[PDB]
Design a protein around this ligand. Structure first.
Ligand SMILES: CCC[C@H](C)[C@H](N)P(=O)(O)O
Ligand SMILES: [Co+2]
Ligand SMILES: [Co+2]
Ligand SMILES: [K+]
Length: 304
């Protein structure tokens, strides 16, 4: 394998962390390949669940707890902390909240969160590498509670970063928020990528094509599929009661990705940096409810 940049995996990985049996587990947790029977049984369906009031309460709660856990990880970001250390803290924080860390064993993903440094687009695996001053690092958190999943992510700065890192992370965040601001009943899911790409391109960045936002609720990933690039062919129209994410990945160089031999870690083919933000959204009647928002503070962590 020819790496695309300076990052490398730092092995070995700690043995898989157990979740006490009193925490309720999603279907894939105990499947030997981490397959989710419930997801597979809707593979290739474009139909979108209309959530009940009970479903809504359940998504509100898990999304709020997920936000709490992200904030725990945010607190840990500093030069010399390993991503595995972050992940151990996340895993304990999930358990403290009586929730399962959704990533763990999802399709045999080995950790409880995803840590994506610099040229890693997404799905980086926490490992023994200490964070370096000048890195950007995204931490992606998903929790499972009472049958519902809640999913969010933010990109963080490790110490002082360069102006390109500032502009990339700020633009990405703005991309997400401009998309969110368009969400309301009657908007086609395919419109969001036009908005995102328009803002990225204006700032000289590209938009990753291989990974999309997604329906989420009883299923970790389900309909709708929400591309983040322009002129996509996404199926469906927003309706009050829909719950989904938006999670644009924006890059300094070109949009093309490839995957490491671990099967998960997605990197820019050119080795330039990428950044991402993610929220879980419920469509309302005004527009939308940002389930994974901060309730106590105005801005994402990288501004603060
Ligand atoms: C390994 C599970 C992690 C999943 C794929 C991420 N939370 P996402 O849906 O890419 O935001
Ligand atoms: Co996520
Ligand atoms: Co997601
Ligand atoms: K990154």
């Amino acid at each position: 394998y020819r790496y695309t940049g300076k990052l490398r995996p730092h092995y070995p990985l700690m043995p898989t962390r157990p979740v006490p049996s009193y925490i309720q587990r999603p279907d894939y947790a105990d499947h030997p390949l981490g397959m989710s029977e419930s997801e597979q049984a809707l593979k290739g369906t474009s139909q979108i669940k209309l959530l009940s009031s009970e479903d809504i309460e359940g998504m509100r709660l898990v999304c709020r707890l997920a936000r709490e856990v992200l904030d725990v990880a945010a607190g840990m970001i500093k030069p010399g902390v390993t991503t595995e250390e972050i992940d151990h803290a996340v895993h304990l924080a999930c358990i403290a909240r009586n929730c399962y860390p959704s990533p763990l064993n999802y399709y045999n993903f080995p950790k409880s969160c995803c840590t994506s440094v610099n040229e890693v687009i997404c799905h980086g695996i926490p490992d023994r590498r200490p964070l370096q001053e000048g890195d950007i690092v995204n931490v992606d958190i998903t929790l499972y509670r009472n049958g519902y999943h809640g999913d969010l992510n933010e990109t963080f700065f490790v110490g002082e970063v360069d102006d390109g890192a500032r502009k990339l992370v700020q633009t990405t965040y703005e991309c997400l928020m401009q998309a969110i601001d368009a969400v309301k009943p009657g908007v086609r899911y395919r419109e969001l990528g036009n908005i995102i790409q328009k803002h990225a391109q204006a700032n000289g960045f590209s938009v990753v094509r291989s990974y999309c936002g997604h329906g989420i609720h009883k299923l970790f990933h389900t309909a709708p599929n929400v591309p983040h690039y322009a002129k996509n062919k996404a199926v469906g129209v927003m309706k009050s009661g829909h719950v989904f994410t938006i999670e644009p990945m924006i890059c300094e160089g070109g949009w093309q990705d490839e995957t490491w031999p671990d099967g998960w870690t997605a990197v820019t083919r050119d080795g330039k940096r990428s950044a991402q933000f993610e929220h879980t959204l419920l469509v309302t009647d005004t527009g939308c409810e940002i389930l994974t928002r901060r309730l106590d503070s105005a801005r994402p962590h990288f501004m603060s």
